[PDB]
Structures are given as C-alpha cells and as structure tokens.
Write a protein that binds this ligand. Structure first.
Ligand SMILES: *[C@@H]1O[C@H](CO)[C@@H](O)[C@H](O)[C@H]1NC(C)=O
Ligand SMILES: *[C@@H]1O[C@H](CO)[C@@H](O)[C@H](O)[C@H]1NC(C)=O
Ligand SMILES: *[C@@H]1O[C@H](CO)[C@@H](O)[C@H](O)[C@H]1NC(C)=O
Ligand SMILES: *[C@@H]1O[C@H](CO)[C@@H](O)[C@H](O)[C@H]1NC(C)=O
Lengths: 49, 49, 490
C-alpha cells in the first residue's frame, strides 16, 4: 500500500498501557469508592460502598 | 469507522487510473513518447484532476 | 579584459592575442620614484573590438611589502543570460592570512550587458622591477606576498535575515545540516523542544539496464517508398509490417520527402519505443489535397474517400511526384469519389462503380438526367501546377503496449542486473525498482501482472524467460527531534 505514499503512523499508546489505565480505574472503584479522583485514595470495605 | 477510512483510501487509489480527458495514466509513458513542450497539455490536465 | 592601470580601470571587449604567460610589471627606475608599467605583456594585438568602457580613476603605489593586509576586495562574478554581474565589497582586516569569521554582505557593482559566452578565465597580475633587484625577466621579477581564494558557486537556498536598516545580518542554510533545514523550514531562528517534520527521503537509482527482444530482420521499405506504382485513393493498399526493426533515420535516402509529420508522437522517438501492429497505407492523391489529410479535418478525401480517425496516433509522410504518376494526356488510373449516400468511416474502402443518384430520377446504371458518376479521374500531368501533381502519401499507424511486442527498436539489450533498485525497460515499459525473482507463475501467454492498484508487479523476460517481480525502493520520510534551540544544537 505504501508505494503510492499512503503512510500509517502508529498510535502513541499501546493496548497494554491502555489496559494498565483501565485496570487502575477499575481498581479504584473497588477499593476507594468515589473519593480517589477528587483527592488522595481512601480505603473502604465494599459492604459500605 | 475503519470502513470509512479504508473505503476512502481505495477511492483515492482508483483515481490513479483515470484520465480527465488524457491519453494515458502513467507520466513516464507520456515522457517516453513526446518531448515536454508537446506534453504540458496532458500534464496540466492530470495535475488539476 | 578589465584591467586597473595607474590611470583608470580599462574595459575592452576585443579579439586580443594572449601570450603564453601574460602579466604586468612595473619598473622603479633611478630617474624617478614613479612605478609605471614597462612589462605590458598582456595581449599581442587588439583587433575587431565591440565594446570599450571608461571607469573612475584608481591611482596606486605598487611598493612591495611583506606585512599584514588590512583590506579585502571580495568579488563574485556571474554571467546569467549574457549579462555579467559583479558583487563587490571592501572589508579591512588585521589578522594573519585566513578568512575572518565575521558577517559582511556584498553589494552589486555593475552589470555589463554584453552577450558573449565565457568558458575560461585568467587572473591578471603585476610584477616588481627595481634597481634593488636585477630588474629583468629572469631574476628581476618579484611577486611580493599575495593570496587569493577561488570558489565555485552552486545552487543553494538560504533564509536571509534582514535588520532594521535593510542589511543582511545572518544566513542560515537549508541543506548543510538537518538543523539548518529545520530552522529555515519554520522561517525562524528560535525553535522549541519537540518533533518536527522536514523533507522526506527515498532511495535513489543506481544503474539502468536494457532487456530488449532480439530480432535480426529489417523491415521492407523498397516499395513502401520509391517504386513504379502506388495505390489509388479510391482503393488504398494496407501492408502488414512485422518482425523487424523499424527505423526512421535511414529513410532519408530512398525518396525526398516534402511532408514529414508525425501526429501524436515525437519524430525523434520512433526508434526509442518498440511498436505493435504497424500498418502502411500508401496511396497517390493530388498535391492540393495534402491539406485534406489530417486527424479530425474534413474534406472531400476525408468524406467520400478514406478518412483518418479522430484519435489516430501515427506519422504521415507524403512527397511530390513530378511525372512518375503523371501523363502528357493526364493520369486517369487514380480515381476519387465525388458523391456518396453516406460518407466514409475510418478504414473504409469503396469498390462500387454505381452511378450516383441525384434527384427523383434513379441512377446506378439507369443513366439519365441527374445521374452522375462520382468516381472522377485526377488527371495528373507535369504541365499542371505543383499543387496539381501526384503525391505519394504513406500513412503509418501503430500501437504501443496493446499486445505483445512485434516491431522493436534497433537499440540492443544490456547485461542482466538483479537485487538492485535500477531503471528497466521491457518492450517499452519503463520503471525503477528492485527486480526480484518471483514464485507466482502465470499461464504461458500472460506476460504481465497487476494488483488492485492496476500497476505492474510481475514481468516476463523476452530473453531469459523468467518471472521477475518489481519492488520499488521508495519508502519512509525524515523527521527530526530537537531539545530546543536554547539548550544546544544536537
Ligand atoms: C616563451 O614565450 C613565447 C611567446 O609567448 C612562447 O611562444 C613560448 O612558448 C614561451 N616559452 C615558454 C618557456 O613558455
Ligand atoms: C575581423 O572582422 C572582419 C569583418 O568581419 C573579418 O573580415 C576579419 O577576418 C576579422 N578578423 C579576425 C577574425 O581577427
Ligand atoms: C541604522 O544605522 C544608524 C546610523 O548609524 C544607526 O544609528 C542605527 O543603530 C542602525 N540601526 C538601527 C535602526 O538600530
Ligand atoms: C534559555 O533558558 C534560560 C533558563 O530558562 C533563560 O534564562 C534564557 O534566557 C534562555 N535563552 C533563550 C535564548 O531563550
């Protein structure tokens, strides 16, 4: 495809680092509730969440 | 969203074989057969298209 | 010859006779202290002059000293379209011989409009002859100390820097280093730390190769040119020319041509391209009907007679025949159609002798009132005018890359080169790429290969008969990353 000069540049982030961000965001609701994106993380059991 | 880019890229691909009222679709074929003053009328007609 | 004497600068444009070693030399005698020119060995004679000029006086002293120089006359000599442009500057110095690192600009001095052509130049110098030395042409000459630099100017593009008084203060390159191309690209001398795109580079061609098809036969041209009879325009003969080199430089010694016109193709690339299906159509018409042969031009020999196509790409050659196709009573062998129910279409021939029908009264052999015969005789005589004399027109129609190569040029094949991004030609098909060995096979008849782009990518050799792939070596671009013009230049 490249002979006519159609270049495809690869994205800045890989799917492994994107999956590292989605794993951090999934862990933050299961560990700290909602008070971790407005401030520093605070633990809390899930039964009270 | 991938379909629209891949379709539009094949659309730009097919335009390489259009004339625009020219005699050939390959610039080296025009250069091989006729001196450049007697080829500018075909070259500008391929360039605008 | 622009020489600064001890009077003024003399500019003479003559035919001089330069010596084996022309130079100048001034003498310091004992009856004076003035250094006049005594060795004026520059030219032997000044004949046939076209330009002489007068310039402002520049008196000199010419007393040899070995000390440090404290001025610099830097000139740049250009000759674009005859006009000679001089860009002068005077800059003092104080350092030991070398070119200072400072920044000066050169202002243009004069532009001599003479349109001569210059290819060689020689620098005129001077000599010291005194009574401290022998003063002769053996051991009397003394060159003092002098050092001049000669540099060739090449095409270059600079981003100039203009101040508030209009002068040029900084010059930044566009090709010396990647950093200078980036700095001229943004049109600025201050660049921040980050990635930037400049020009994009590809791989260049290295060699070129020929793999033409070999054919020893030479095409028949004996009767295609001078002969003893030619075809009538009413029924024009087509000859099939194939399996032979077709040349055009060698065709200038059979018949003298009065019209050598090639439509659609340069008359200096007939031998540079291999042909396909060469059709020779020879017929004699009248010399005042040469204007009627032309692509997309009507006439009587373009309607009722053979009509050229309106997309024809070929050559038309026709010459005058004085009395070969002419008679003292007139030549009536050659006939032309003068009435038609429906005009003739490209490559159509008429063989009907019917009488043409005009009006209600029927014809076609029921001869009568308004029953004319369209086929008239031309009537060629040598006593007629030159527009009324027979012209043997030979029209050569041919194809280019519409079928396998049958008629080819005289140039021959070269060595087979592989694994390199080289320019190639196959039957006439040109490209640049790496010719790799292929593993896809066509069927025997198939001699090309295309993709979804519709571009060639597999060719069959007319020599070695091997499938070879074509791979361009053009790829990628060039991007650069800088830590900011402040911090450094890496
Ligand atoms: C000496 O000068 C004459 C005239 O210019 C020239 O013909 C001759 O070749 C010169 N000889 C040398 C040594 O150059
Ligand atoms: C100078 O010009 C005249 C007139 O054109 C010519 O006859 C003569 O041969 C020339 N002499 C040369 C070429 O030195
Ligand atoms: C322009 O030349 C004048 C005259 O010497 C000088 O005073 C000035 O500094 C120069 N450039 C400017 C406008 O600063
Ligand atoms: C370069 O950076 C230093 C530190 O920020 C600053 O003081 C200086 O003015 C800068 N110079 C330029 C040319 O921007």
């Amino acid at each position: 495809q490249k002979f006519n000069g159609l270049t495809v540049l690869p994205p800045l982030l890989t799917d492994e680092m994107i999956a590292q961000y989605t794993s951090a965001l999934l862990a933050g609701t299961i560990t700290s509730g909602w008070t971790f994106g407005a401030g520093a993380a605070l633990q809390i059991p899930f039964a009270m969440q | 969203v991938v379909n629209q880019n891949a379709q539009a890229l094949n659309t730009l691909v097919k335009q390489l074989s259009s004339n625009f009222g020219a005699i050939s679709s390959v610039l080296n074929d025009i250069l091989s057969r006729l001196d450049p003053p007697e080829a500018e009328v075909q070259i500008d007609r391929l360039i605008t298209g | 010859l622009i020489v600064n004497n001890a009077t003024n600068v003399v500019i003479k444009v003559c035919e001089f006779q330069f010596c084996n070693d022309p130079f100048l030399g001034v003498y310091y005698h004992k009856n004076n202290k003035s250094w006049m020119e005594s060795e004026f060995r520059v030219y032997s004679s000044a004949n046939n002059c076209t330009f002489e000029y007068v310039s402002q006086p520049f008196l000199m002293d010419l007393e040899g000293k070995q000390g440090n120089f404290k001025n610099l006359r830097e000139f740049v000599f250009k000759n674009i379209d005859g006009y000679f442009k001089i860009y002068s500057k005077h800059t003092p110095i104080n350092l030991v011989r070398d070119l200072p690192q400072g920044f000066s600009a050169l202002e243009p001095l004069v532009d001599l409009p003479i349109g001569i052509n210059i290819t060689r130049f020689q620098t005129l110098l001077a000599l010291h002859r005194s009574y401290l030395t022998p003063g002769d042409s053996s051991s009397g000459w003394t060159a003092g100390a002098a050092a001049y630099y000669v540099g060739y100017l090449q095409p270059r593009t600079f981003l100039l820097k203009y101040n508030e008084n209009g002068t040029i203060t900084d010059a930044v390159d566009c090709a010396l280093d990647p950093l200078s191309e980036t700095k001229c690209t943004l049109k600025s001398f201050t660049v921040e730390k980050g990635i930037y795109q400049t020009s994009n580079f590809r791989v260049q061609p290295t060699e070129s190769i020929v793999r033409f098809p070999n054919i020893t036969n030479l095409c028949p041209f004996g009767e295609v040119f001078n002969a003893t009879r030619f075809a009538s325009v009413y029924a024009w003969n087509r000859k099939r020319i194939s399996n032979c080199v077709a040349d055009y430089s060698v065709l200038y010694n059979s018949a003298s041509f009065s019209t050598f016109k090639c439509y659609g193709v340069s008359p200096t690339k007939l031998n540079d391209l291999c042909f396909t299906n060469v059709y020779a159509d020879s017929f004699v018409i009248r010399g005042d009907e040469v204007r009627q042969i032309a692509p997309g031009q009507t006439g009587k020999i373009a309607d009722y007679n053979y009509k050229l196509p309106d997309d024809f790409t070929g050559c038309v050659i026709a010459w005058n025949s004085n009395n070969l196709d002419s008679k003292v009573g007139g030549n009536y062998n050659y006939l032309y159609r003068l009435f038609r129910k429906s005009n003739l279409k490209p490559f159509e021939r008429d063989i009907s002798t019917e009488i043409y029908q005009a009006g209600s009264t029927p014809c076609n052999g029921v001869e009568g009132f308004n029953c004319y015969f369209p086929l008239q005789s031309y009537g060629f005589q040598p006593t007629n005018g030159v527009g009324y004399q027979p012209y043997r027109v030979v029209v050569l129609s041919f194809e280019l890359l519409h079928a396998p190569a049958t008629v080819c040029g005289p140039k021959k094949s070269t060595n087979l080169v592989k694994n390199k991004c080289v320019n190639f030609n196959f039957n006439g098909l040109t490209g640049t790429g790496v010719l790799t060995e292929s593993n896809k096979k066509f069927l025997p008849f198939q001699q090309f290969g295309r993709d979804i782009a519709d571009t060639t990518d597999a060719v069959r050799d007319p020599q070695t008969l091997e499938i070879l792939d074509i791979t361009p070596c053009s790829f990628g671009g060039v991007s650069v990353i800088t830590p900011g013009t402040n911090t450094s230049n890496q």
